[PDB]
């Protein structure tokens, strides 16, 4: 049963180092080269280097020479990738691979931000405003760090008609929004509340949407 098991997600501060691991089972790492690959959403896949665990020989892509150090502990069938002098440009998923087998990836987040709970703001439609058979409401979840937040509507009871958007980074902090579309027959007689948990800050906020009744 060939399996490359990578270490868990890490969140670190700019300037730090990390040492990612990749443990093989079902074969001997001394028999084949092990590679590492970086993936970011915008910039895509980039090959970092390989190590030959049989003799500890390495080759790095020039751009990673200053940054990456590959090693292997053959007695524990594990390869390691040390990444140093980290910056936000190192925030990525890192994969190990050998032969035609890829590991599951490790997410690395690098930031200088301080832990910050989101500011959660209601996006309230007009009451008098009668928008076809359906009404869209929302919540803005602004300026938090780190990921993730967990957004629910009506304590999780309302999942139909929800769009919770991917977070985007604003000046080192994250922002996202969530919309929910409900039957106009039900609103505002049935209340709608967003719930936004941010475990990293020991917070969970509720914002009841109150109709803008001008």
């Amino acid at each position: 049963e060939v399996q490359l098991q990578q270490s868990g997600a890490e969140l670190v501060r700019s300037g730090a180092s990390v040492k990612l691991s990749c443990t093989a089972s079902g074969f001997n790492i001394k028999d084949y080269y092990m590679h590492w690959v970086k993936q970011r959403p915008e910039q895509g896949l980039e090959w970092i280097g390989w190590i030959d665990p049989e003799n500890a020989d390495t080759e790095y892509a020039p751009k990673f020479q200053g940054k990456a150090t590959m090693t292997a502990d053959t007695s524990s069938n594990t390869a390691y990738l040390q990444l140093s002098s980290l910056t936000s440009e190192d925030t990525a998923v890192y994969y190990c691979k050998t032969g035609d087998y890829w590991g599951q990836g490790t997410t690395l987040t690098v930031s200088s931000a301080k832990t910050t709970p989101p500011s959660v703001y209601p996006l309230a439609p007009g009451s008098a405003a009668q928008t076809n058979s359906m009404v869209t409401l929302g919540c803005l979840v602004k300026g938090y760090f780190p990921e993730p937040v967990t957004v629910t509507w009506n304590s999780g009871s309302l999942s139909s008609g929800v769009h919770t958007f991917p977070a985007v980074l604003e000046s080192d902090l994250y922002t996202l929004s969530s919309s929910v579309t409900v039957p106009s027959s039900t609103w505002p007689s049935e209340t709608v509340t967003c719930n936004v948990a941010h475990p990293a800050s020991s917070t969970k906020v509720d914002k009841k949407i109150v109709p803008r009744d001008c």
Partner: protein
């Protein structure tokens, strides 16, 4: 480095119909050893990449014969004779001839469906936010198809680019539409120096833009 450019960026597919994806390299991938080290990967959402083709045309174990690869030099093609559901995801070409090995930017295969206009909703800043000294105006553009959409903000009738943050969902698993959020953030002071705020969307479903607006001095 060798640059690997994929065409198209997105291919809209129909189950049972063929698909073709192109990869152009900036330099020949013919190795001095006579082999051409060009691979294809598929990555399904939230999953690790998996190789389907190596050495231009060789299929990996378990890959169905609906897939074929061809190419030489700087030009490569992946073909799927008939698309199946399990084929959807992002395909990358991948060259190893030239050190360092490099990857294309990816081609997304997405499901074609009937055009659908966005449902557009606009929201002023909350009073809670306005106490912060910041002011965000939020526009949702929901459940539209195809994914190509242009969103523009106007303040007092003049187009505004600075301070906009956009985010997009992936294709919905149930209705095959896309959604988008656009947020314009101003200082409270700048927000209170203007009256009219507009989110405008141009989408192929209509020749004229969808305009959603509020005025601070109106309902």
């Amino acid at each position: 480095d060798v640059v690997m450019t994929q065409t198209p960026l997105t291919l809209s597919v129909t189950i049972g119909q063929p698909a073709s994806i192109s990869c152009k390299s900036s330099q020949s991938l013919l190795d001095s050893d006579g082999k051409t080290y060009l691979n294809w990967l598929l990555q399904r959402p939230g999953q690790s990449p998996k190789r389907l083709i190596f050495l231009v045309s060789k299929l990996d174990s378990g890959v169905p014969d609906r897939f074929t690869g061809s190419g030489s030099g700087t030009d490569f093609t992946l073909k799927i004779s008939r698309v199946e559901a399990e084929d959807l995801g992002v395909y990358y070409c991948w060259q190893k001839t030239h050190f360092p090995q490099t990857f294309g930017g990816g081609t997304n295969l997405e499901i074609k469906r009937a055009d659908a206009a966005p449902t557009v909703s606009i929201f002023p800043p909350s009073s809670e936010q306005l106490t912060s000294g910041g002011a965000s105006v939020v526009c949702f553009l929901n459940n539209f198809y195809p994914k190509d959409i242009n969103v523009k903000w106007k303040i007092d009738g003049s187009e505004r680019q600075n301070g906009v943050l956009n985010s997009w969902t992936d294709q919905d698993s149930k209705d095959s539409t896309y959604s988008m959020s656009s947020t314009l953030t101003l200082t409270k002071d700048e927000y209170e120096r203007h009256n009219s705020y507009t989110c405008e969307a141009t989408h192929k479903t209509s020749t004229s833009p969808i305009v959603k607006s509020f005025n601070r001095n109106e309902c």
